[PDB]
């Protein structure tokens, strides 16, 4: 429980799901909540609203660590990614800075061939 002050809020924002991992400055996790585990299932995981409910259900169950202010990292080009940080302005936090950690390779490995 550790009585931490500030945290780093990683938001993995893929197409089929958003998971929200609130950690500390150090980089080791304090609590996470996903858009799947909030009652939304299958296609309904892939909405911004499930990301908002995920950010709520993380922002409490990190209450016991006592975080006043947090940074926001967002990885992934998904349908959440903005409603989930409106849901961290509204959850009672002070947003220090917001970054983008979406991995853009200087094209390396080959992508899959997926669609027809």
């Amino acid at each position: 429980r550790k009585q931490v002050s500030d945290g780093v809020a990683h938001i993995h924002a893929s197409f089929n799901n958003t998971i929200v991992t609130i950690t500390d400055r150090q980089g080791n996790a304090l609590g996470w909540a996903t858009a799947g585990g909030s009652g939304f299932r299958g296609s309904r995981k892939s909405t911004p609203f499930a990301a908002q409910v995920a950010a709520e259900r993380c922002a409490d169950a990190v209450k016991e660590y006592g975080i006043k202010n947090l940074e926001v990292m967002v990885k992934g080009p998904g349908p959440g990614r903005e409603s989930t940080i409106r849901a961290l302005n509204a959850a009672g936090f002070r947003i220090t800075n917001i970054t983008d950690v979406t991995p853009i390779p200087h094209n390396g490995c080959r992508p899959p061939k997926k669609r027809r």
Partner: protein, 65 residues
């Protein structure tokens, strides 16, 4: 991308630069190596560019409105 500033901030600047270069390169690179149709899609894109420029230019005569 990286937004930090004083108390009116945090949304518009970030969704601007984030949304443009992020959604561009990730929505591109997410699948389809293709090896062949960036050539076709750039050729069609730029032929459509010169056809749109000349088409609007000679379409700048009249429209009877």
């Amino acid at each position: 991308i990286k937004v930090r500033e004083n108390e009116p901030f945090d949304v518009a600047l970030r969704r601007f630069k984030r949304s443009c270069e992020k959604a561009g390169v990730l929505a591109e690179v997410r699948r389809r190596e293709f090896y062949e149709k960036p050539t076709t899609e750039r050729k069609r894109a730029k032929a459509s560019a010169v056809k749109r420029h000349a088409k609007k230019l000679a379409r700048e005569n009249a429209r009877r409105t």
